[PDB]
Each structure stands twice: as C-alpha cells, then as structure tokens.
Design a protein around this ligand. Sequence first.
Ligand code: HEM
Length: 123
Amino acid sequence: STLYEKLGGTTAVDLAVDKFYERVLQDDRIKHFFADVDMAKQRAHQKAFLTYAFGGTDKYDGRYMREAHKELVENHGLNGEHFDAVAEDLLATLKEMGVPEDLIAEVAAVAGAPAAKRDVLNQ
Ligand code: HEM
C-alpha cells in the first residue's frame, strides 16, 4: 500500500508534489534536464520520484531507470551532483511542509539509495 497512505490522502500528496515540482522548476542546477519536457510531464516526474522515495520502489525497475535516463547521462551530462540536487530538493520541500524529521530521514535513505542511483546514472 502506497504514498497515498503514508502522507495522508489526496490533498497531502498534492501539496507534497506541487511544492517539490515548484522547487525543481526553479533549481538552476537541474532545470536544463527538463528542457525538452512540458510542465505536465515534469510534474509527473516529480510525482514519480517522490513516490519512489516514500518506499514505492516497486514500479521503478533499475533497467527502466537505466534506459529512461540514458540520453541525460550521455547528452546532458547527468551525474551524481544532479541526482543529489533532486533528492536535496525533495527533503527541503518536506521540511517546509512540517513532515516529521524522522520521516524525512527515512525518505532521505530511499531517495539516496545506492543501487537505483547507479542505474539512473548509467554507472
Ligand atoms: C531514483 C530517481 C529517479 C527516478 C525513480 C526517476 C524516474 C523516472 C521515470 C519513471 C521516468 C520516465 C517517465 C516516462 O517514461 O514517461 C523518468 C524520466 C526522466 N527523468 Fe527521472 N528519475 C529519477 C531521477 C532523475 C534525476 C536525478 C533526473 C535529473 C536530474 C531525472 C530526469 C528525468 C528526465 C529528464 C526524464 C525524461 C522526461 C520525463 O519523462 O519526465 N530523473 N525518470
């Protein structure tokens, strides 16, 4: 059972995702990776990342993660600094929203988990 459960329903999830989206949209370190992507799809990405980071790793197979980001790695220069900025942006969002520091630390551990990071980064 999902994200919808752990943050507390539609409105909580919508707040989380909108704030995370808003932060990433304004983050000069990482915005150019979404240059070829419309706002609906960028938002859907932040919803996916957030879903992954709250323990729904379930539907992001590492092989999908590797193919999905391959052109970013090869052509946009995607690397660890960028990955870490996305995770950092999520944690900053959750903290602004009063999520308990114990829970932010739990998502910090999934967001930054090594094996999915190495798949995304095509390492
Ligand atoms: C574990 C971390 C991440 C997960 C779980 C993840 C997940 C995904 C998934 C599922 C897609 C495919 C969407 C589709 O097929 O429509 C995707 C696409 C994408 N990801 Fe990630 N991603 C992660 C990290 C990153 C990072 C660090 C960046 C860049 C800083 C990034 C940039 C993008 C881009 C540019 C796309 C292509 C456009 C889009 O479909 O939104 N992702 N990501």
